[model samples]
Target: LPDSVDWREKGCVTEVKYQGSCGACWAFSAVGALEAQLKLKTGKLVSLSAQNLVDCSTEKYGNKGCNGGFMTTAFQYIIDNKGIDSDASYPYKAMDQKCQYDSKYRAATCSKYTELPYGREDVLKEAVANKGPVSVGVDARHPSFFLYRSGVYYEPSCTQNVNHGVLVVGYGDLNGKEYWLVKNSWGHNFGEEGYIRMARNKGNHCGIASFPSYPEI
Candidate 1:
């Protein structure tokens, strides 16, 4: 993994997203992975629609619009729906709405998706470093995480019962503390320009290493 990597600096990551007050983290997470993979494949970064997944993947895919979802399930929604539309076409409303998907507006499609071995940060790092951003689950309900600032976050109560999904763009050491550079769905006003550095080497703090997964273009 070249010791450490920063996909953001490599222009492989999309701009930070704002999921608003909605619990559409899964959509954002899937979009993040898609954007990175697309950038790597085409050298162009286009924002995919989180709104499409939010509206359409609910019933049969086990997703709750503006409530919760699994990144893998959202990916399957994209594959099943042909492909996901771009943000310019679908646009994020941050609220539940009817599926307005149009195949003509499709912007990106994933050939397939894969899940990393559970709780395997080492392998996850290799995947992120070589491929691109990875969708991961985390326990983002903690107050510390909700109000995180600049530093590696290490919440003691972080558990394996993952609730919210996010993207791990890269990893690095901050002030001598190794951390995972995670992209959050919160607006740019939160954390380090809408991102967080979770304390690494502590056995999946906030369940960051539990459900790592990514899609292929």
Candidate 2:
């Protein structure tokens, strides 16, 4: 909305994080939203533990964890669990392991998490503007997704099955085309230093707009 917006320049986003060979993008996506929410609420950019969710959330909430998962269920797990630990106390092993969460070691808590209406970009944009970052599910199995280098990515055939999770920090226009500024967990070497600008206003391209949500601190 407006002519354009960039939350990254406004410091609403954090440093890019890597998920390694693990299929824990869902954990990364949920943690990314929580990190931004904490920064917005407490003025401190704390990196929460993605591994905490990867290890503990699956059995209870039905998320697949390292085998692929969903941000919706991940956030629900965080809310029910009260809070999660920081990355420092429980570093990521890049693979599934035992959950290291301790109540005394929590760096952040999710009082609640909100989900936007399905297929509603207008509402999702407002959530990102008013809240912090929102975690979303997207179809990442396409070859075009892997080969993306720069520019707003658009592949007409991208599915809605939601195989991967990512974060939407902001929205902006590139070359007169609207796009969502997305953050990925595949490490810095991948796609625009761990970010992707996706074509917006096209009705859930790659399922980005279908599963938008954020946590409140």
Candidate 3:
């Protein structure tokens, strides 16, 4: 596989999005992966709506809306619904609201979703390199993670128990320090423009690969 791969540089990744105080990271993570996959397949980058999933997927797909959720379920909801709306059409409210999804506003669709082996960073790396961006679960209970600015992040105190969802857009090494390029839903002001270079091949630090998944466009 290649030493490095960044979907952002390939123009498939969208701008950083903020989830506010809501527990909708799952929605953001799932949508981010689908956005890249759609762009990679059609060569057209259209920002999909996370709010649509957050509101609509909760009832039937086992998602908990802004309270918390899983990316796989979000993907399944999209697949079952046939397609999803665009951010321009549905937009994000960050809070729970009645589902307002309209088929007329549909922007993208996916065939299926796939999950990598648990705690397998090797498989995660290959998927990110060969496939598009992948949604991942990570433990964000550390204070350092909340204030992370740059550099490869490695928190020994962090646990395998993941509570937050994010996207792995790429992987690379910074001066021999291997890292996975992670995109967050905490806005562009956080980390490196809402991105983090988490320690890679380090026993699935913070469970980055524990629940790694992506939609098939």
Candidate 4:
């Protein structure tokens, strides 16, 4: 899959996480990669406040359930409002929560949105290319998901959207092997700490989180 891909290398490593059936794609994508990057760079698995993204991010784009959103906007919300973990601050409403956020980090300010073409490889390349975490969404096109481990992937639908929301940390070869290091939203019961990978990024939604660089915040 890498053969047909034209992605860049930059971003940082991230940890795996699960977001269940919540319409908080912006939250998951924003914090997922941030968690990993912070961990790799700081060695601290600090839980980022998803509530900030949920309550603050909605103001920009129209939302109801998980109808639609752009990751760039979410990054800005974090920067403007700062952030907090679900435990220390606002908790997920399971759906698109109202814009009544109450967190200590709500003052943190983020940059503006920088939209880019949507693609697994392209998004991953953009995130890393910019040396920052990128937010992305996809169709979870599978009945049974691949969880908790590291290996080549064979997702249900690549061209079609199924699963939604994830983060791309970095790229690496496993003891002579090679693949994208993705962060998932299926909980630790899934992939390694909750992550999986597409055998290759042929474009579309084979791996939604695949990004090289997305705007920096």
Candidate 5:
């Protein structure tokens, strides 16, 4: 595998977005991965609607709109629903609302998804290398995580209890320090311009490899 790969440079990554007060990080994470996959397959980079999943992926699909959700289930919802609208059509409201999905505005669709091996950072790295960005769950309750500005992130106190969803866009070694390039939904003002270089090969710190998955466009 290559030592580094940034989907951002390949035009597969969209600008960072903010989830506001909603617990819809899962929607953002899933959409980010799906968008990248769509771009990889069709050479088109249309931002998909996280709000579509937030409002439509109900308890039946193991998702709770703005309350919380799982990236895998969000992908499943997209597949079951045939496709999802673009962000411009189904704009994010950052809060739970009635489903307003319109087939006419559908921008992307995934036939299926694949989840990497749990706790296997090696496998996760391979997935991000061969595939596009991947959605992952991580422990983001640590206060230091929110204050992270730059450099590789490594929280020794962080646990394996995944609570937040994010996207792993790439991996690299900074002066011998390995890290995973993570894309967050906290807007551009947070972290490294709305991204985080999380410690890699560090025993899956923050459960980054616990639930890594990506849609198949």
Candidate 6:
């Protein structure tokens, strides 16, 4: 994590509530990235409620949180509120049905997306060079992921539909094979104690996901 990569160090952790049937994938991803960066920079992991971003974010104009989403909108939400965090502070009711949480836990909130060039390869290079951990999504549509009984560092597929989310810690090798070391949010009950091997496919496959690592400190 280098004295604070991208101006953050004391990183924040969060659980993206399933926006039931909403295509808010973009929204969650955007907010998730912002949340991490906010925590890193501020040393605070305030739980910013997502619904606010969903209902108020300007980028969310045409999409619904359950069926679709936008990262830019979420980015704006954070920039507006300053930053965001976990549900313990923000809370969620499964669907974007009601509003019950406050605005204290958020590392950032929004109405529009921030002007940041986000994509693959580029984000990966940034994370590896500096930062604590990174989070990403991939199509967990594998026979293994489904029957994925357990074991921490097993390899995974990063293709097709997006279902799984994980944290990228550091890069290392074991028994000669190199892989991206990552943490899973499915609790410690899954994979290598809730972690994945995340092979760095020469083609950028097998769990090759990337999101901004924002820390609100």
In order, candidate lDDTs are 0.89, 0.85, 0.93, 0.52, 0.93, 0.49
Q: Candidate 2 on 120-186: residue-level lDDT in tens?
A: 8888888877777889988888999989999999998897667788999888886789898899998
Given candidate 3, what's the lDDT at residue 74? 94
Give per-residue CA lDDT, model 5, range 88-111, as digits (tens): 999999999999999999999989
Candidate 6 regions exceeding 4 Å error are: 1-32, 46-63, 68-73, 80-86, 98-123, 149-167, 183-188, 207-217
Greater-lDDT candidate between 2 and 6: 2
Q: Write the per-residue lDDT of candidate 1 for residues 1-217, one digit (tens) a residue.
A: 5767888898877788899888899999998899988888889989999999999888789999998888999998887877999988999999999999988998898888999998888988889888889999999888999889888899998887799899999898866798999999888888999899998888877888889899987
Would you give me the overall lDDT of model 5?
0.93
The sequence of per-residue lDDT tens digits that candidate 6 reaches over residues 55-81 is: 555433554655555444455455655
lDDT of 3 by residue, 1-217 (tens): 9999999999989999999978999999999999998898889998899999989999678788989989999999899999899999999989998999999999998799999999999999999999889999999999999989999999999888889999999999988989999999999999999999999988889999889999997
Residues 57-166, candidate 4, lDDT per residue (tens digit)?
77454433354454655665555555434424565555565666665434223444454454545555544544554555655556534532557665554544434666
What's the lDDT of the predicted structure labeled candidate 1? 0.89
Can you give the lDDT of residue 209 in candidate 6? Answer: 46
User: Pairs clashing in candidate 3?
Assistant: none
Candidate 1, which ten residues in sequence have the lowest lDDT sum? 1-10
Candidate number with the higher TM-score (2 or 6):
2
